[PDB]
Amino acid sequence: SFSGYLKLTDNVYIKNADIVEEAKKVKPTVVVNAANVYLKHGGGVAGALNKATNNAMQVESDDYIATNGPLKVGGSCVLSGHNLAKHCLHVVGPNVNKGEDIQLLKSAYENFNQHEVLLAPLLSAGIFGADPIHSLRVCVDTVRTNVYLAVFDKNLYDKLVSSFL
User: In terms of C-beta density within 10 A (0-12 exposed, 13-18 middle, 19 or more buried), how is residue 80 classed?
Assistant: First the structure.
């Protein structure tokens, strides 16, 4: 199971870890991907998770988009977890660098409530441009299910823990 996580609340845990390495170790039921509406897994968490699947996540995602069209910002879809997890929950947080509404971050986190336990990154953080401190606050105030947050950046992890209210 999950090890070395710091408990933030009753249901939110956090660790400085590479979510790919965490997923390969734990093999969780659900790994969350920081997806975009097109499921184009180019960079950040998405690029890293996809590379770990040897591009199988991208091939599956392109078939999903060809059938269903793009996701909504704030939405999600459940696809295979490949070699990383049973399932991957692809969640689209708003990308502040694309001028998307930061208010959609709460809607994005609500997708986590459909799963009892998840391994996840902070939505809209990193290359999505939102303040990770704000993302962690929205996470703890929105998600009611058990979420194990993997924060890639060590310095950011220290900042998040030390500023957590």
Answer: middle
Length of the chain as a residue count:
165
From edge to edge, which strands make up the β-sheet containing 12-16? 6-7, 12-16, 146-151, 117-120, 30-34, 87-91, 76-80
Instruction: Report the C-alpha dihedral over residues 99, 100, 105, 108, rounded to 10 degrees.
Output: -140
Which residue carries 């170790």 as its tokens?
25
Burial 24-45 (b: 16+ CB within 10 A, else e): eebebebbbbbbbbebbbeebb
CA angle, corner 119, sides to 38 and 114, nearest 5?
70
Task: Kindly list the domain boundaries of the chain, sorted by start residue.
Answer: 1-165
Q: Rounded distance, CA 20 to CA 37, Å?
A: 21
> CB-side exposure of 64: number of CA atoms within 13 Å?
19
Task: Report the alpha-carbon distance of residue 163 to residue 133 in Å, rounded.
Answer: 8
Structure solved using which method? Answer: X-ray
Enclosing H/E stretch for 118:
strand 117-120
